[model samples]
Target: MENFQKVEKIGEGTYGVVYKARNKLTGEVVALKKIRLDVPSTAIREISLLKELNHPNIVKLLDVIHTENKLYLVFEFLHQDLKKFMDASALTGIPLPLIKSYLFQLLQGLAFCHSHRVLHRDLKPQNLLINTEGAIKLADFGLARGVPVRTYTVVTLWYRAPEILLGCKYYSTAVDIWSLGCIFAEMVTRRALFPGDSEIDQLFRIFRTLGTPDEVVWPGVTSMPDYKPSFPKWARQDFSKVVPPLDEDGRSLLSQMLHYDPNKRISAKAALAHPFFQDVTKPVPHLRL
Candidate 1:
């Protein structure tokens, strides 16, 4: 506590209030997350998982401090999140190369996590941190699971996978891939691909765009806990129509990520290798703000 000085309240995170702080001795800036003991389990889980994860696209856990009723996690500071970056550039639109670079780094992080058997159940632009160097790092592992198994209420609605939305209990890393697809489209359009008001509405929006799934499209989808025979059947729309700015390769990758069958959904490793990212050989240059 005495070693750092709180600069300002940055934002509210999943389990706590995050602050911008500077190390008193070295003047190094960092993100200080103050976790209330009320949700100690989440904090512990995050710390344990982060301790084992060390990747370029994953946020670094610098230090940990514990008090009587609070646990403070210190992390490398990032300039902004993907959400803020996207909002600031909404008028001009993110460059195609930059979008590709960001998505590639995101998939790299996800690939690392999935390889370790960890699942980042919640993936959204707000949870993706960006620094001045244009590096994107995955953060906020509060809702993540380091499991072989275990939720319908975990992911944000717009990015939620169809399987999870349909109350499928045996979801896998493919859930993150679904969110990745939504994020990819949002990066292209600067708007949510499925901005559904309610859970059912969300499913409808997805079905309306991607076409209603069936046993042929997604084996056992009709048997999902939330499936209904009365649901509307819709024809699939071309990705080019939805995300006009995306190129051919990008549309192909997006389709694989958004596939109705979790078993058929592209893996993070496979996505990283997609032709859409063939030319992304380096980190994207910092955005010109």
Candidate 2:
């Protein structure tokens, strides 16, 4: 409250406003997240989950303040988000090695979350915070749920997993992996891999690109609530043509991540060891317990 001074408003969303603030005594910079009273459930979920998560690639929840009518969360301030960083580098494009570094860090964070039985249901570029040191920290866990989860209305349209789009009620960490695949392709091309206006349109974009799945490819897919026999059949396109910047190894990894079957999709831990990251020489500082 009185101990800190608001410097500038950095971000605003449906939840609340985030401010770059300064601690009066320590002069430490922090992102002050003010939660809107309308959605205390979202705030509570994020606070409860973040308090238990401690990882280098996950944003730290520094402090919490409760006033008469508002709730504020304190976090270590980062210079930018991956979305802003990617946009800034749009002209020259994010380098392959740097993309590897960022993606590696992202996988590390995801692996940690999955290991703890937490699902980051929302993981778009805007939710990944980037520091000046080139580190990526996963942020915005409002939609995240602990394993034994729910509602298909979780992830953003573009990054929603096939199972979710197909109206599968129960899903696994594979949903997040699918998002990572979309993000991986976006990193290579500097644009969204699937930009759909509606849920059906999103499914169409994914089907048109990766081919419509059947019982042969995804066992029981035909049983999904949204499955329709009238749907257009689309043959899978070559990954090399889809993401031209990626090499064979990168495309291989992407395909596994975007697999139709959740059981067959690559896990976050497995993806870190994939050949696509073999040339990523940047050393991760440390593994926080």
Candidate 3:
């Protein structure tokens, strides 16, 4: 595209290589995502929504340049991603202030998404980016959905919500909250809370830590299309044993996100107001979409 010049390859995936590019008009750095004609719905969905989702904490999709033979998306570029950042700090763990800042920004982005009825079904550490200014922006909407739907098999197993793992086709924004909780715990523990071997094992891993769900706890869990009535029951472990470094307010907020019933899980807006963020609530100004 004449508007931007690709400088270097940033990364590659099923879609294609993302490039670090510079805008010819403004000389601003941006991420150029070039993809095949057969790009997934999530990419298309990202285009549809990010075009309108203007927030400082959400990755900005600046422009879409469609050529006769190629497709490209222009996004504001960020230097590092959360996974890489965490891995680099694994030995010492991320600083508490930075952790609060990162997760707070995450909830802000999620709150913005939910307010518009968007569900970011995929929100692991790798999908989050951080700029040099300590700004954390949510990215990688390759599996995000505009609305809740039936028969979702896309959420990554470790961060996948129980309802989706049990093949409960019907789900809501709570799925994103589940993944948010997973990332939070990972940030605190410097490890994956539930690195399961399979989808079934993933559910068991979650159950053993959060306790097995009963018909009473999750009213329709037994009726899920793939729910197994005989799945072994698990006793919930104390959260302190799981996320040992979390403070009282942080653990309380994390528990709200990890609720067994999707309906009981905290909404992104509610999460932003949690006590853990009481001293961290100074709002950042909105930039551009």
Candidate 4:
């Protein structure tokens, strides 16, 4: 309750270094996040928002303390993250049904966030925590924010929504759903669904996979920030050929998430009932009981 004794340094997060510390009072393990102040206090929003988020599927914000000009956040510590699970050669091979379960848990967590009008703007494998029981918890809310009356371009580029990519300031919860799509695609292959080198190229990568949107799929898209009429075509390759690892259901879900029109995309709550995730009961590995 007084101060954190030295524990091992975990790793650098978007805000600052995180450590696994033991609470002197109860001897319980906790993640001590030390946010350096020189960095913009944009983190203040995450702190405020995270404290209000309460869900079993979500990582709980235990406590926050400000001491000696540094901000320390106490959190429920998890052993590792989803990216580590996906990357480890020994554990890289996860069953498809099980993978769907994990995806469902992710949607459940996202559903909770979206229901409250909050966006986990920086969602990715690295930010998804896997507890010892293998339940996934979304962490790192540096860019997470309650849906402002005015929209903002805050989602990460690779997982960012099409409306955001178009530079629309007034956005919706659909932006986070878009990122969820990207995360789902990445879960199976452990590869970026759309790894664009530049801004224009990013759009190219997305449009190529799902096909370019026009006034039909995304009306007024051309009026967005830095919006262009068209992009050069690549060798129209079938998405299945490139991502041969996926099945029919996988491909369909990908299509929904990759839509250029945010409004047309499936909501996080709806995503849970989608056939892709419903086939299995337990979502995620021994998911949060």
Candidate 5:
């Protein structure tokens, strides 16, 4: 908008270019993401969903500016994203307290999204923004959409769920839980949990770690459009070996979130209450009895 002054380019994403800006009227800093109108569906989805979704741990879409050629989406400026923070911690390793806190906030925001019947189809460290005060917020909804529906198959390979990689036509928010599990492990190890190079390789990596699934474990998987019947059989490995630095509780929580069956995958709301986060401060909301 004309009222805001551009500061500098923050980064470029698949859909748009983000910049740090200052509100001339209020002197508050904000992020302006210029969305190309040629691909307006992403922008429309982001605008419509963010307009109604409001949660402390979710990035707030403050405003939208539509010009003749360019469309801009305004969001509260965060100092950096989780990817940058983890990359910076390559030598020192991410602190345990910060890990628990960030993951807790991530689940909290995801719970809010699932409760609203929305699925953040794309989730990775790069999309999780962090502020200077140690607060983490879920941002970048360019791939988000309504849940309990079919999909066009969108998820970063490294963090994609088994069901998604297996080509499950219809999916739910369980996909996000799988991505969260990958992110949790990465926080502990400063490296991707399953950095597969291709679709088949991705599935193979997951199977090798968690073991190949059969019809007994994943009902109807055999009938999926892209189901592969002859993957090598491997036994599940201990999470300690997978993410050696994670505590017992954290490892157990990751196991629950990364279940091979989407139905067995932990929900964001349930994850927030897990013992892994017992020490994380959570102010319960009052309920109507």
Candidate 6:
């Protein structure tokens, strides 16, 4: 199993142990993800779904090599993910424009997956790889499930949307939108917008900022399975007040991104084309530099 292998154990991942390996055939460096024989069924399902994804902005699964005792997933070598970049102070937090560029690339990756009917249910900063080229690549499809017309289990409570917290099983790409918005806000403030300890608390966090959605805004919201928390329905505040630094366009986009109604929430394409992006994320400033 160790043919041509100069292996450096990198770390542990969701599915198994990871290593940096070299190919004796081509002298190429690659990532080797190792999973044992007893890996769960969900692990197999996840890898199968990952193998179908082929995007420039997504981590490439090069080859699947297996032995009687273990399985190896060869992947294109990447330097580090956004989480490490943030920790090492290698990332630029200078302008919203740069943030938009990253978000644009993020959306591009997500759009490619969604186009193929895939939902990356566990998208987070750590799962997003930032290669040496400053390019953002989506990784960890382990939690991904085909974008069904209806789904029940979700990942990561903080990135989840109100409808999901309220126990709506039937959902679409809107779930990803909500997560993307949370990520976007993190990039903007360098902190998580909602850090709820649980589902009910998450709903309250959204309500306190966006205010609770009423029957007028979300027609069937009250009928949701977990909507029993009796919180005040405040209508006096607005997006601008809550997100004060945002200009009109930014506020408008926030309103759309954080919309309570899943049906009305703006799609990722609209988010990119919004005037908010125009105001905040200007052109690649100094492409020459």
lDDT of each: 0.84, 0.83, 0.80, 0.72, 0.81, 0.70
> Which residue pairs clash in candidate 3?
151-169
Across 1-289, the per-residue lDDT of candidate 6 in tens digits comes to 4554847876564546778889878888988877666444566666776787988889998887766557788888776766665545435552566666677787778788778777776677777877645577887664533121121222267888888788887667778777877877766666667888877778788888777888888898888888874767755366555655546765676667778888898877667677655544424322211
Residue 149 shift from truth in candidate 6, angstroms = 32
Name the candidate, 1 or 2, with the larger TM-score value: 1
lDDT (tens digit, per residue) of candidate 3 on 139-256: 8674433221222212257888888888866569999899999999999899998889899889888888888998888888888888878888889899889889889999999999
CA deviation > 4 Å runs, candidate 5: 39-46, 144-155, 281-289
Better of 3 and 6 by lDDT: 3
Model 4: CA > 4 A from native: 39-46, 90-92, 144-156, 233-237, 283-289
**Candidate order by decreasing TM-score:** 1, 2, 5, 3, 4, 6
The 10 consecutive residues of candidate 6 with the worst lDDT sum are 146-155
lDDT by residue for model 5 (1-289), tens: 7888999988776657788999999999999987666435565665766678899999898987877567788998887788877777889887787888888999999999899887887789989987666678888774533211121222378988888888776779999899999999999988888999999889989989988888888777788778867778899887779998778899889899988888988999888889988888533211121
Please provide TM-scores, in order, for all candidate models, with all chains considered together: 0.89, 0.88, 0.86, 0.84, 0.87, 0.78
Q: Please estimate how well model 4 matches the true structure, expressed as its whole-model Cα lDDT.
A: 0.72
Clashes per candidate (backbone, < 3 Å): 0, 0, 1, 6, 0, 0
Kindly report which residue pairs in candidate 5 clash with one another.
none
Worst 10 residues of 5 by lDDT: 145-154
Which candidate has the highest TM-score of all?
1
In the range 94-153, model 4's lDDT, one tens digit per residue, is 667767777778788888988887777777777888865547778876453311112111
Model 6 TM-score on a 0 to 1 scale: 0.78
In lDDT terms, which candidate is top?
1
